[PDB]
Structure formats: structure tokens, C-alpha cells
């Protein structure tokens, strides 16, 4: 449950936060990186998906970008 932790981080552990910040849900994906790993299978955005969806959809970004991908939190998970 690494993503969790990086959900606490990103967004207090809210995964259905939409605050308008350029980001959504648990782990604060931009619409963009939601799309490009295969989010819209699941809901329209990523706050709209549910928890085990956004960590899928968390699991392929990491896979192809790293993670990078979440700057400050991944380390503050302990991740790789």
C-alpha cells in the first residue's frame, strides 16, 4: 500500500479530491498523464475513478515514467 502513503502525501488521502489545481484525485494526476496511461477505461477523470482504479492507472505511469512522476511525495512513501 505504498500508494497510500503517496495518497496521504499528495492529497491528505482524499481520492476523489478535484480542487482545481490542475490535478485530481488521490495521487493528483494531471488530465493529460490520467489520459495517456489509460484512464478514461475506468472514469472520466481521475478523482471520478475509484481508489483501486487510480493506483492501476498509478501502477502503468510508474511502469513507463517513474516516479518521478510524484516529486516529494514517492519519497516520502519510501518508494524506489
Given at each position: 500500500s505504498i500508494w497510500d502513503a503517496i495518497a496521504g502525501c499528495?492529497?491528505?488521502?482524499?481520492?476523489?479530491?478535484?480542487?482545481?489545481?490542475g490535478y485530481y484525485g488521490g495521487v493528483q494526476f494531471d488530465q493529460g498523464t490520467w489520459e495517456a496511461n489509460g484512464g478514461l477505461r475506468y472514469a472520466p477523470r481521475a478523482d471520478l475513478a475509484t481508489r483501486e482504479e487510480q493506483i492501476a492507472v498509478a501502477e502503468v505511469t510508474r511502469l513507463r515514467?517513474?516516479?518521478?512522476?510524484w516529486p516529494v511525495c514517492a519519497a516520502r512513501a519510501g518508494a524506489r
Open positions: 499528495e492529497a491528505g488521502g482524499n481520492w476523489a479530491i478535484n480542487t482545481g489545481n515514467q517513474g516516479w518521478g512522476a
